[PDB]
Design a binder for this molecule. Structure first.
Ligand SMILES: CCCCCCCCCCCCCCCCCC(=O)OC[C@H](COP(=O)([O-])OCC(O)COP(=O)([O-])OC[C@@H](COC(=O)CCCCCCCCCCCCCCCCC)OC(=O)CCCCCCCCCCCCCCCCC)OC(=O)CCCCCCCCCCCCCCCCC
Ligand SMILES: CCCCCCCCCCCCCCCCCC(=O)OC[C@H](COP(=O)(O)OCCN)OC(=O)CCCCCCCCCCCCCCCCC
Ligand SMILES: CCCCCCCCCCCCCCCCCC(=O)OC[C@H](COP(=O)(O)OCCN)OC(=O)CCCCCCCCCCCCCCCCC
Ligand SMILES: CCCCCCCCCCCCCCCCCC(=O)OC[C@H](COP(=O)(O)OCCN)OC(=O)CCCCCCCCCCCCCCCCC
Ligand SMILES: CCCCCCCCCCCCCCCCCC(=O)O[C@@H](COC(=O)CCCCCCCCCCCCCCC)COP(=O)(O)OC[C@H](O)CO
Ligand SMILES: Nc1nc2c(ncn2[C@@H]2O[C@H](COP(=O)(O)OP(=O)(O)OP(=O)(O)O)[C@@H](O)[C@H]2O)c(=O)[nH]1
Lengths: 99, 459, 139, 98, 55, 120, 320, 37, 347
């Protein structure tokens, strides 16, 4: 008989014991409670209040701040008349060119 | 970051101290709670990383990745109590312990400020994953897979070790900050090339890169479902995360010493997607799909372009969420039929109406349908690569054509068609399987509205 | 390291006959060492079989050194660039091909070209840059 | 360094080579063993007497009295290996193949 | 041909075959004391010899 | 290294001149880390002897952490000593051999020419 | 503490406690020879420690509560089903022989351990040297497979060599016609069909090797059925020997310390009975072994180390 | 149930030398108790 | 052996080793090695089985040969300088001569063929003594003369030892042979850094030591002598295999499991010495040790193996050994990576 081994187990249909089984556990009452708490701290607690939390996070990358200073620059540099965007950022006066 | 690590560590006694059947509930609810605290870090300041201490720091690169890992932790837990329930209390308790030790290392890895501290935990993820694959893996070949997995990534990581310690003695500090500010031009000396190879090869192996990619079809095919996703959903991204971080000292040697990898990747994606056009095994089909999408990120990273980097991280997380999901799809059908072959179980839309949907927009997300962030990731890489070279589109564009043919092919063969006559053990799908699918789909499409939280520091 | 000093003294791509001569001596001595160990750890039959095994190991090693020595030097002459590590690479594969001929197997020769070709490039790689395989205590 | 000084030195080398290869006999192997210490006792003796190291003359006798602890244990091992296997032949010491 | 015939034979199987091939020889010692000491005698001789371990 | 430092009396675990250092605090994270090691050993001990891991030999558990935390404190003081000792004679050598420690010119990036490599 | 190296250093000897009543007297012979009854009388009058026939449930008898455990939890082989079906494909034949030999070996250690710690002689039914006769006969009738004979041999060679032999074996010589008449007198529902050829092959296996083997190692005192009933005669018979043969008379405190070291440790005694020789009759696969071990572990007493089970009422477990 | 190594798997890991060869075919595993006028 | 005789026998073995570490005179060093050999042999000859006699004879012949070969090297030093102290020797020939003699007593270079066999024949308990305590005294002397060591010779000894340590262990099934080949590979790891830093050698010593008793004494508790015999341990003692597996993982050197600490610091220290090909090669071939480490780990806890019917008997009884020092050895050899800056304590 080759080896004294157990036969292949039979797949258990959770609906066979309790038709209202919910695939979280064999025992019905905690099976029910696992659902209520997985859905709660998951579909609702993090997927809704978490979603609005990240959605309502304060200004990311200072995007609003970047816009507000932007027009102040253009309004300044359009009023005087000099070009609104210099080619080089670091001032060549402050730099020391070798040779 | 101690607001995340400490509760994760304290959750380890939590599971072991729990009762007989309450382990799944308490572990799930608190892990989900840990996920919520992780979302507190999504706000990245203007141009500075959210440096907390010398030990731990976070920026817009690890901010989405961290919450992906914490969010993942319930999903393996929600995907494990099916086959694990037929086991002793200790072994189930042990299984939960490993994944929590897994995420703890992952949380520490992404938040590490020092490349050595990055390095230690970066290899340390092998230890829990190896035992998970070997112990509870439901197959025979898994024993060969564990050796294949462990050595392959270590064979690249060990040369990495000598690279970092060399940097420490030569440049000075080794943390992520000083390296960036004190970065110096790397010469073209042949020693610098070998240091470039050492500093890079370890990360490419875990991506993987075409050729150095055979450990995915071994590991993923017969890994346990819970271990399959994490290895597919983040551990591949772990190799990705180091790619941005360590390519701050490898300039400008990146421009010349990248051509072999670009050619290996830009050709591998066509070849690996051509693998996917025909796979007898559903899980192997998904694993090779991960190779192609990851090969996109290798191209993305190696160009070292602003647009390329934001597309890289967007695709990196987006692929992880959908690749993990598709693995859950395989586990459900494999559970009913107790096999992995494609054609054995077919016409499953008629038998299971809702799973027909779940596998449907899973395929669409895998297809980079706009505006799903899979598209906003792939499309960015095309634009960056096209700027790098006009012929990149011929290959990388053809990927989206090949990616479509196989993606629907598994949808055609399994879900659509005629129901298998002899198969009669397929019961109605439990709400756990349906819920778990929603825990993946909803955050994906929800995050589509705000890609700025996934586009990384370069955004 | 006089035997190695012969190879180092002759500049690459010049005086090829002596460059091959140094390689043969390096190969033969290396083949003699492993042959003596093989005789020791695995005692063969009557001494004629012992010298027969010694003949094989030395001849293989001498052949590998000889062809590698020629190819590494004559190629630098033809291609007019001595610093290129590719010089040893082809010579490394060239020497690797001889092993397949001596072992009577294409697979072993192919593997030798794959590996010994790379190492020969790496050996020249250190000579150009200044790598120290055995660094003295410095710190 | 005088001619005789290395007449012992080679004698040690010959004794070492004799012990470093076994012909057929463990007793003959042991004979080269304390032969090596004999030259070792001898070689030390010339050094100490020549240099007038008035306090190092201790070392030779204790070099012998401690090499004996090797020898005494030496044959006593052989008597064990030559009563189970019967013969002092050293080719019978291959029973530990695996 | 490419994935699971060659790419599995270039790196993995070649290294595995080499390690196994060099393992079968270095661990198949004959257990005879004669050959062990004779192996030392070469090592002692040659160590104090042509590697020039004196300068 | 310190090996033969001029005045290193042998077999001296914590030399008396090391007390000038600030002693490690009782709640040091390093010190309490090996209190875990004592605790972590406690679960291991009765596990091999097949005993309730958490609730068995509470006296044994108390000994393991206490013994670990004790030897740890003295080991920690030795740890702080040599590192401070490593630093002490270090700086002393610097102003003892100034010729090997020149001060590089503090020239701002205004003059420094670092070549720029475009990435395309 | 128990006998350790410290105790021997500080005074604990064995030859001081040894005396005349220090004889291993194993009663052996054919099935249904009344040797068990005679052993009680010999031990009773001599003041010797009797040892009842160690069956399948002897290991559980010696430890725990002594109550029999389930066959799945102990043995996985029944002499009942043994007798019912000779050549069962499940291999109950050899599995029983290996388990029974293990119980015989365990009983032998208990005899020596008790003998050395108290100084009273021992009498045991059959012996670890009386267990090969059955398997050899069981091989001749085809009751087992050939490799069963081999596997039993190295188990004996690795284990039986270390322990000492007895001094005076007791044999109740009973012929085949008598035991064929005797078996039907009991009426148990598995011994009423014992094949006469089996009991026939038991006795000549005793003839050819059993007595000659231990004759050089111990005295052999044979008795017929009539000569065994009168236990008064044999009592004086065994008190008039020398037991010079065998290594037992030459036994100093040095060897005694090592022997008491091994018998007081009830793991090394039976350690080599589980020698990794995979045979179909005795090898248990991973799944079946794992399930049974869970069944054994969930049983009371065996959950933790002895004296550490709260399920029975062990108090002060927090400071033990 | 998951795959579990059988006796055939053990025999692959059960020889005196795991990588057998003609030079080791004759080799035999050591005895278990190490005992060989 | 009478316990009082055995205790005093162990006692002089420790005293012989201890004398080596505390003796300035070269002659006293040879005495300590002589006493250590003089009492190591009877411990191996405790079981009194032919394998033990084989192993003791091999061990004695190679150790006694190196002992008097060691004595010759001292005399040459006396011949060329007239000194007796251990500071820095004064003759290049004597440098190699004693380096060969010292190294053979550790079994790392081609002078290592005894190590796998001598531990195989002798018992497991005495094996713990051979591969842990008999490996401090020769290492102690080598650290003292590390100034005058010849790097070219010494590092060639290190490379061969690690290469042979991994390759030899791949082909072995007797777990005693596994340990010795692993020990040789570890010996090459520690032995490579003496010319650079003796302190890192010490740290590699304690970590390797604690690891060996952790593995050896766990093997004692399981009472197994082959991989197949170790396989059945899962059924009787499932816990033992659980820690035994984590010890094997650490033995490979996978972070954060301590045991990666020496390999890490060894790589770092040589890297400071501009030696960077050398650390890579040993680190790369360190994976060879991991293969049979996983292989042993695979068929002990990770995958259950076919047990035996008589194994049910073993469950009923309990272990009698008090497994002293086993628990704290596991923890100290598996979790002390965060406490690495204790390197300063050794200096
Ligand atoms: C750094 C961090 C790590 C290291 C930390 C330090 C501790 C290291 C050791 C941990 C424990 C190891 C151990 O016992 O494992 C179990 C292991 C097996 O124990 P076992 O199963 O009981 O078998 C042991 C005997 O065979 C059993 O034979 P027996 O049945 O005859 O019983 C004899 C036994 C039990 O004791 C007795 O019988 C008592 C004897 C009393 C009479 C003598 C009185 C006079 C002397 C008193 C001394 C006090 O005593 C001995 O074995 C004698 C030697 C040990 C104690 C005396 C030493 C000095 C004089 O122990 C041994 O095999 C002992 C090996 C020798 C000591 C350890 C050597 C390895 C470590 C070396 C490096 C240490 C660090 C260096 C830096
Ligand atoms: C730039 C300066 C140098 C210029 C010249 C080039 C270098 C020297 C020449 C080439 C040396 C490397 C090539 C191999 C030489 C040895 C070949 C040899 O021993 O072959 C015999 C044998 C292989 O065949 P076998 O496995 O026995 O199968 C047939 C059985 N009937 O062998 C064996 O079975 C044993 C395994 C092979 C022998 C051991 C390894 C030998 C090589 C070690 C490194 C040598 C490096 C030399 C150069 C640097 C140092 C000077
Ligand atoms: C440094 C010296 C290291 C010596 C190691 C000795 C044991 C390992 C080598 C061995 O036994 O075989 C390897 C080599 C070639 O052996 P080969 O002729 O191929 O035969 C193999 C099948 N019997 O046989 C040898 O003796 C070569 C060993 C040195 C290679 C360089
Ligand atoms: C670095 C990465 C990780 C590395 C290590 C990985 C370890 C796991 C994997 C090991 C590799 C092999 C695979 C697993 C094999 C397991 C084999 C085994 O023995 O399993 C069964 C075994 C039976 O245990 P048993 O004797 O029944 O006792 C249970 C508790 N009474 O089970 C056991 O023995 C397990 C028992 C668990 C007991 C743990 C007790 C923890 C107590 C925590 C207390 C916390 C208190 C918190 C207080 C907070 C306030 C201060
Ligand atoms: C499976 C094989 C490996 C897979 C691929 C991994 C990556 C490929 C390259 C691996 C390189 C490993 C060693 C690199 C260590 C760090 C490199 C570094 O810091 O750069 C140095 C690069 O220098 C080197 O020489 C590094 C090693 C070069 C390659 C030679 C050894 C590595 C290849 C063989 C071993 C690894 C392969 C496994 C073999 C079994 C710079 O130092 P330098 O040379 O400028 O030093 C100053 C002076 O010039 C003297 O050194
Ligand atoms: N396998 C095995 N079975 C044994 C051994 N000793 C006794 N038995 C079994 O013990 C049981 C009873 O034996 P019987 O001889 O019938 O017992 P009885 O009728 O009391 O007669 P006596 O033994 O003469 O006292 C049978 O199942 C025997 O096979 C032994 O050494 N090995």
């Amino acid at each position: 008989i080759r080896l004294q081994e157990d036969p292949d187990p039979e797949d258990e249909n959770l609906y066979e014991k309790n038709p209202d089984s919910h695939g979280y556990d064999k025992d019905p009452i905690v099976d029910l409670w696992n659902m209520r708490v997985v859905f709660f701290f998951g579909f609702s607690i993090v997927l809704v209040l978490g979603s609005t939390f990240v959605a309502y996070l304060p200004d990311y990358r200072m995007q609003e701040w970047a816009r507000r200073e932007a027009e102040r620059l253009v309004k300044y540099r359009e009023a005087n008349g000099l070009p609104l965007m210099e080619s080089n950022c670091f001032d060549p006066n402050k730099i020391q060119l070798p040779e | 970051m101690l607001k995340i690590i400490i509760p994760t560590t304290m959750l380890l006694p939590m599971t072991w101290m729990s009762k007989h059947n309450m382990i799944w509930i308490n572990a799930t609810v608190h892990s989900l709670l840990i996920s919520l605290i992780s979302l507190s870090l999504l706000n990245q300041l203007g141009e500075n990383s959210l440096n907390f201490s010398l030990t731990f720091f976070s920026d817009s690169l690890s901010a989405p990745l961290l919450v992906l890992t914490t969010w993942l932790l319930p999903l393996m837990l929600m995907a494990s109590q099916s086959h694990l329930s037929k086991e002793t209390t200790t072994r189930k308790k042990l299984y939960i312990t490993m994944l929590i030790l897994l995420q703890l290392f992952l949380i520490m890895t992404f938040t590490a400020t020092e490349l050595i501290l990055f390095y230690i935990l970066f290899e340390a993820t092998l230890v829990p994953t190896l035992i998970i694959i070997t112990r509870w893996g439901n197959q025979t070949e898994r024993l060969n897979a564990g050796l294949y997995f462990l050595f392959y990534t270590l064979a690249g990581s060990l040369p990495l070790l000598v690279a970092l310690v060399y940097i420490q003695n030569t440049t000075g500090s080794l943390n992520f900050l000083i390296i960036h500010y004190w970065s110096h031009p790397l010469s073209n000396s042949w020693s610098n090339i070998f240091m470039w190879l050492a500093c890079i090869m370890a990360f490419m192996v875990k991506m993987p890169l075409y050729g150095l990619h055979l450990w995915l079809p071994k590991a993923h095919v017969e890994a346990p479902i819970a271990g399959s996703m994490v290895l597919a959903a983040v551990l591949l991204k772990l190799g990705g995360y180091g790619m941005m971080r360590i390519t701050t000292i490898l300039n400008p040697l990146t421009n010349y010493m990248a051509y072999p990898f670009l050619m290996l990747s830009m050709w591998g994606m066509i070849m690996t997607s051509s693998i996917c056009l025909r796979q007898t095994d559903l899980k192997s089909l998904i694993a090779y799909s991960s190779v192609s999408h990851m090969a996109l990120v290798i191209v993305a990273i190696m160009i070292q372009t602003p647009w390329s980097f934001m597309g890289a991280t967007a695709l990196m997380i987006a692929h992880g969420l959908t690749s993990s999901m598709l693995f859950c799809l395989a586990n459900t059908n494999y559970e009913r039929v107790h096999s992995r072959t494609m054609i054995l179980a077919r016409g499953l839309q008629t038998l299971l109406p809702l799973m027909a949907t779940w596998w449907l927009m899973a395929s669409l997300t895998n297809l980079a349908l706009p505006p799903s962030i899979n598209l906003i990731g792939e499309l960015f890489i095309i634009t960056a690569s096209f700027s790098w070279s006009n012929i990149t589109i011929i290959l990388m564009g053809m990927n989206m054509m090949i990616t479509a043919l196989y993606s629907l092919y598994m949808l055609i063969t399994t879900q659509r068609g005629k129901y298998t006559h002899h198969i009669n053990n397929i019961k109605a799908s439990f709400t756990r399987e349906n819920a778990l699918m929603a825990l993946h789909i909803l955050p994906l499409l929800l995050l589509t509205l705000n890609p700025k939280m996934i586009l990384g520091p370069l955004y | 390291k006089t035997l190695l000093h012969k190879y180092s003294d002759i500049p690459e791509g010049t005086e090829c006959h002596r460059k091959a001569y140094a390689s043969t001596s390096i190969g033969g001595a290396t083949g003699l060492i492993v042959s003596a160990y093989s005789i020791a750890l695995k005692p063969p039959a009557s001494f004629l079989e012992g010298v027969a095994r010694t003949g094989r190991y030395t001849f293989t090693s001498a052949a590998i050194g000889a062809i590698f020595g020629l190819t590494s030097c004559i190629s630098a002459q033809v291609r007019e660039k001595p610093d290129d590590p590719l010089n040893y690479f082809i010579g490394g594969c060239a020497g690797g091909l001889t092993l397949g001929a001596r072992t009577r197997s294409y697979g072993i020769g192919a593997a030798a070209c794959a590996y010994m070709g790379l190492t020969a490039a790496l050996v020249k790689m250190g000579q150009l840059e200044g790598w120290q395989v055995f660094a003295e205590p410095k710190v | 360094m005088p001619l005789v000084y290395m007449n012992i030195i080679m004698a040690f080398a010959i004794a070492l080579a004799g012990l470093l290869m076994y012909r057929s006999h463990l007793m003959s192997s042991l004979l080269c063993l304390e032969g090596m210490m004999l030259s070792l006792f001898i070689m030390s003796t010339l050094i100490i007497l020549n240099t007038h190291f008035t306090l190092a003359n201790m070392m030779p006798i204790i070099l012998l009295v401690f090499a004996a602890c090797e020898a005494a244990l030496g044959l006593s091992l052989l008597v064990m290996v030559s009563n189970t296997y019967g013969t002092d032949y050293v080719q019978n010491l291959n029973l530990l193949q695996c | 041909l490419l994935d699971l015939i060659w790419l599995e034979t270039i790196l993995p199987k070649t290294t595995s075959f080499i390690q196994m091939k060099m393992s079968i020889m270095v661990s198949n010692q004959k257990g005879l004391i004669k050959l062990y000491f004779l192996s030392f005698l070469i090592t002692i001789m040659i160590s104090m010899t042509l590697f020039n371990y004196h300068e | 290294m310190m090996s033969g430092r001029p005045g290193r009396v042998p077999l001296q675990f914590l030399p008396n001149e090391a007390r000038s250092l600030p002693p490690p605090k009782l709640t040091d994270p390093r010190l309490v880390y090996m209190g875990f090691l004592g605790y972590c050993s406690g679960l291991i001990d009765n596990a091999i002897r097949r005993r309730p891991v958490v609730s068995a030999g509470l006296h044994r558990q108390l000994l393991y952490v206490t013994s670990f935390v004790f030897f740890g404190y003295y080991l920690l003081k030795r740890q702080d000593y040599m590192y401070a000792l490593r630093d002490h004679d270090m700086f002393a050598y610097v102003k003892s051999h100034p010729e090997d420690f020149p001060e590089k010119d503090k020239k701002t990036y205004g003059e420094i020419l670092e070549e720029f490599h475009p990435v395309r | 503490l128990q006998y350790g190296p410290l105790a021997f250093v500080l005074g604990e000897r064995t030859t001081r406690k040894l005396t005349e009543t220090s004889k291993v007297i194993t009663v052996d012979g054919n099935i249904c020879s009344g040797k068990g009854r005679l052993a009680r009388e010999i031990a009773e009058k001599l003041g010797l420690r009797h040892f009842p026939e160690a069956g399948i449930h002897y290991a559980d008898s010696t430890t725990g509560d002594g109550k029999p455990l389930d066959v799945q939890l102990s043995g996985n082989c029944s002499l009942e089903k043994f007798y019912d079906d000779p050549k069962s494909n499940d291999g109950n034949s050899y599995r029983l022989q290996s388990w029974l030999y293990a119980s015989r070996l365990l009983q032998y250690a208990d005899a020596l351990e008790h003998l050395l710690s108290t100084g009273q002689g021992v009498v045991l039914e059959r012996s670890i040297y009386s267990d090969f006769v059955f398997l050899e006969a069981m091989y001749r009738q085809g009751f087992i497979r050939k490799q069963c004979v081999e596997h039993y041999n190295e188990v004996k060679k690795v284990t039986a060599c270390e322990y000492l032999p007895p001094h005076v074996v007791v044999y109740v010589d009973v012929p085949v016609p008598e035991i064929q008449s005797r078996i039907q007198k009991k009426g148990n529902p598995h011994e009423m069909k014992i094949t006469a050829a089996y009991l026939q092959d038991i006795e000549n296996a005793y003839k050819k090797t059993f007595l000659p083997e231990m004759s050089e190692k111990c005295e052999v005192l044979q008795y017929s059925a009539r000569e065994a009933e009168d236990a008064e005669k044999v009592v004086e018979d065994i008190e008039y020997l020398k037991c010079d043969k065998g290594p037992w008379p030459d036994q100093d405190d040095r060897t005694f310390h090592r022997l008491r070291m091994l018998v007081q440790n009830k793991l090394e005694v039976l350690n080599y009975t589980t020698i990794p020789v995979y045979l179909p009759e005795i090898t248990i696969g991973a799944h079946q072994s794992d399930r049974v071990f869970q069944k054994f572990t969930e049983l009371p007493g065996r959950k933790y180390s002895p004296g550490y089970n709260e399920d029975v009422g062990d108090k002060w477990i927090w400071l033990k | 149930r998951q795959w579990q190594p059988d006796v055939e798997w053990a025999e692959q890991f059960g020889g005196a030398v795991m990588y057998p060869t003609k030079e080791t075919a004759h080799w035999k595993p050591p005895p278990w108790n190490d005992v060989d006028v | 052996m009478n316990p009082i005789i055995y205790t005093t026998l162990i006692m002089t073995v420790m005293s012989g080793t201890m004398l080596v570490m505390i003796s300035s005179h070269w002659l006293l060093i040879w005495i300590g090695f002589e006493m250590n050999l003089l009492a190591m042999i009877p411990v191996l000859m405790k079981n009194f089985n032919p394998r033990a006699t084989e192993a003791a004879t091999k061990y004695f012949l190679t150790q006694a040969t190196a002992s008097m070969m060691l004595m010759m090297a001292i005399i040459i030093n006396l011949l060329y300088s007239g000194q007796w102290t251990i500071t820095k020797m004064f003759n290049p020939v004597a440098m190699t001569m004693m380096t060969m003699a010292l190294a053979m007593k550790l079994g790392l270079s081609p002078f290592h063929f005894w190590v796998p066999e001598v531990t195989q024949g002798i018992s497991l308990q005495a094996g713990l003594l051979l591969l842990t305590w008999q490996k401090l005294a020769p290492l102690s002397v080598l650290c003292q003369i590390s100034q005058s060591i010849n790097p070219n010779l010494m590092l060639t000894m290190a490379m061969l030892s690690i290469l042979i340590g991994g390759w030899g262990g791949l082909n072995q099934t007797q777990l005693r042979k596994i340990m010795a080949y692993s020990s040789i590979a570890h010996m090459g790891w520690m032995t490579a850094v003496l010319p650079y830093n003796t302190t890192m050698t010490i740290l590699n010593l304690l970590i390797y030591i604690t690891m060996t008793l952790a593995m050896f004494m766990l093997l004692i508790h399981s009472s197994a002598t082959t991989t197949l015999s170790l396989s059945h341990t899962w059924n009787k003692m499932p816990v033992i295999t659980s820690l035994m597996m984590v010890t094997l993982l650490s033995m490979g050197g996978l972070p954060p499991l301590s045991g990666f600490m020496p390999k890490w610091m060894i790589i770092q220290e040589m890297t400071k010495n501009e030696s960077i090909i050398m650390p890579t090669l040993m680190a790369m071939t360190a994976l060879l040790n991991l293969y049979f480490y996983m292989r042993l780990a695979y068929s002990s806890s990770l995958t259950m193996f076919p047990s035996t019917n008589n194994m049910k008997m073993k469950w009923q009884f309990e272990h009698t050994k008090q497994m002293k020092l086993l628990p704290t050895m596991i923890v100290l050899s598996t979790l002390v990576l965060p406490m690495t800056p204790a390197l300063s304590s050794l200096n």
